[PDB]
Design a protein around this ligand. Sequence first.
Ligand SMILES: *C(=O)CCCC[C@@H]1SC[C@@H]2NC(=O)N[C@@H]21
Ligand SMILES: [Mg+2]
Ligand SMILES: [Mn+2]
Ligand SMILES: [Mn+2]
Lengths: 586, 191, 91
Amino acid sequence: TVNGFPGIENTEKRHFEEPRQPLLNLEKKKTAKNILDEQGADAVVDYVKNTKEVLLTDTTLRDAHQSLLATRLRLQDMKGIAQAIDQGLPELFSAEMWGGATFDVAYRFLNESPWYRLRKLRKLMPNTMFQMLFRGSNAVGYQNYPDNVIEEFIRVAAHEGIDVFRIFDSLNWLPQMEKSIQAVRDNGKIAEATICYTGDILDPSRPKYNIQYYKDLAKELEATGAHILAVKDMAGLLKPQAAYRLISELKDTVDLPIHLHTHDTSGNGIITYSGATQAGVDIIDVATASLAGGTSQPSMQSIYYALEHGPRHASINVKNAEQIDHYWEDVRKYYAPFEAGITSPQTEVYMHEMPGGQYTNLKSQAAAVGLGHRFDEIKQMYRKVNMMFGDIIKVTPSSKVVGDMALFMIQNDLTEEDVYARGNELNFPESVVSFFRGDLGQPVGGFPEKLQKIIVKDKAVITDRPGLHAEKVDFETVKADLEQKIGYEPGDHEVISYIMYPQVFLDYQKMQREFGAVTLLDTPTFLHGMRLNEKIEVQIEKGKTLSIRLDEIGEPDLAGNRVLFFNLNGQRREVVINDQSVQAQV
Amino acid sequence: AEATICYTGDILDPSRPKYNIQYYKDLAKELEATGAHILAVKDMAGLLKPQAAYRLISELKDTVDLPIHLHTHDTSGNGIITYSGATQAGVDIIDVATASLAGGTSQPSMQSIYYALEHGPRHASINVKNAEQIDHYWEDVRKYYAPFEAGITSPQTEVYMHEMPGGQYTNLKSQAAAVGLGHRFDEIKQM
Amino acid sequence: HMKKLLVANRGEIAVRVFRACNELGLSTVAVYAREDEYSVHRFKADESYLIGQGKKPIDAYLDIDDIIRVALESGADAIHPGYGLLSENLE
Ligand SMILES: *C(=O)CCCC[C@@H]1SC[C@@H]2NC(=O)N[C@@H]21
Ligand SMILES: [Mg+2]
Ligand SMILES: [Mn+2]
Ligand SMILES: [Mn+2]
């Protein structure tokens, strides 16, 4: 109330009506989650293969709000509709609700445990399969981790309710994927081996990523025993004819069901999905209509009517989906400070190949610096830096390397031959040297050998798997150190979160000891505090509701402290809070 | 002269038999009876589904020999696939907008319909590199018209439910909030 | 054996039965009308639930079916009526 939410500009708290609850026509059906629980992963794969209709995966809970709302969507708005999604849409193959930037961002900004969100959603969605985005050898963090950490995370995530693991590598490298695939198979869940699509397969001018490359990569992915082959189109680069040809050549190569995930950045997501559907794709990644379009996924309501009378229909209840979209439209208005720019079909993504989350994150990062007025120059430098690096796959975290490298290039007025000439003395950013040293793996075709020695001058490079060279982590001593740090015995999930995000988890624990469970608050109250003469009700437990009324905000004293006159549970309680704007000791 | 058929209902849905395929065929015959040069098909509310788009254009292509001009909106988020369905059926001209002023209640993008039809049986006759350079101007000019922006726009398949054209959607919602019915605008759309 | 008790009353007598139940090692459930949201007895129990939504508050405290529904959904094993409202109610 007095200092505002950090990172956004302090508004007043707008009056928001209650979001519209859906009027659902329930239909009891057997889902893929039931088949996995009773008969295992192979029967789920056979059920997917025996479905003539194209299956839908809901990316509303992870990817739609990662692309549009800067992954700031909270568990309160999720749990307001999780039961309605689980019951009204049993036709969904899975719901992607975890992984990616969600794990870090929830702890860092939302001050809620992603494990807690997973537990609440699993209790609220018993018949819907849960899908996570697994980033290969670096499961949710950016730095590389040992193999025991990866299998421990896979075991704990599978135990807590994650059923489908979309496992991908930043550079499409099999040694950084097959261990995670084996661990997911051993835990009794479904492994989704994923190819990151880049470039154009129908463009002869770029033969580095042609159809034979994807064919052999799919062959080696099928050789690892993964249940479902996935094709991640990170930047919406898959053109519809290219989609049809790629899905056909992947369908006549491997026997695995094909999962397609694309973005609507160029505005061609719906037609790309339909072209893959004609070629025989099995599951496509869609979002709800109110969180679709732009950098996000195509709408599931739109993709129903796009294939309504074709050879293959979409398996979804479109009336229930349209009813749930009313709630999603209502709760999108809470996240107005986190809204991105004005949406439009951006076909320039075919040039620079920036992922949408990488696009908006780099735009904010370049807007922090005064250089951000030439964002077109930044995008051109991104394209030319990607070409100079050897046309690498630009996804998290390799897209961050390209973005930082190009921003360093036009930040100090560098050029390709210029950075070749002066690269002996230049101090490159940490992402570029860590990429060229091999910490993100080995790219296809290798590094540019002259540029590699120019980028990293004295530090040792590695050509093998970074997980082989990772320092050994023992869970008992880490658990004891964490118990010393947080003051209580931690769970396996708490230790696992401490390993990958040490400072982030500790700062989350400090925020938990200072402010408590702020995830139970509603989003306008979470973001804008409390208004004068406002009444809110906070349900902290089943049967325990906190009645909080803000009666009067006092004037700041000479020490900068303000006294807020709250009415907690009928009784007056004066809370002293320091105003950061008011200078102290005056 | 561009004689125009306004499209309503759903030709592929038998529960609405008034505006079936034969009605549009007879109307196209009547319009070709006049000296009209090009037959125009107006989809003011974006109601033409892509499967219906392929069916309607093909049944009009063998009925009359006039060129078919298709105009539609992507309020439902299906404008591009509708144009691609009509391109396979043999449509001649389609109505597109620049990318910075496309999407929502507007027309599907000119720049995105090129890449959708790229490496297909029929390409889109346009210079997409020149169109992308022009779209930078319209992106900058649209910032001048911030007070007239509709707001946060998403694909809306409820336009299949109420069949409100996009011009009527922005206008009628303005009057409902003006009189005091903006909070019950959903019930206005239901009725 | 009883583990949880609901009080179908308000005010002083509800707090008295809550204190007796806490001395006897029992969980306590409170019920309150919307107009009694600032009553002490709501916050003196382990669980509190709104009853008689939309009715007059005295009629809310005389709602047999809502009180029984709250006691059943809260896991309460017994109901203490206190005095006045439904203590002598046969139904
Ligand atoms: C309101 O209806 C609560 C009951 C208050 C009156 C009843 S009538 C019998 C009890 N004796 C008394 O003084 N008050 C109780
Ligand atoms: Mg299938
Ligand atoms: Mn994505
Ligand atoms: Mn029009």
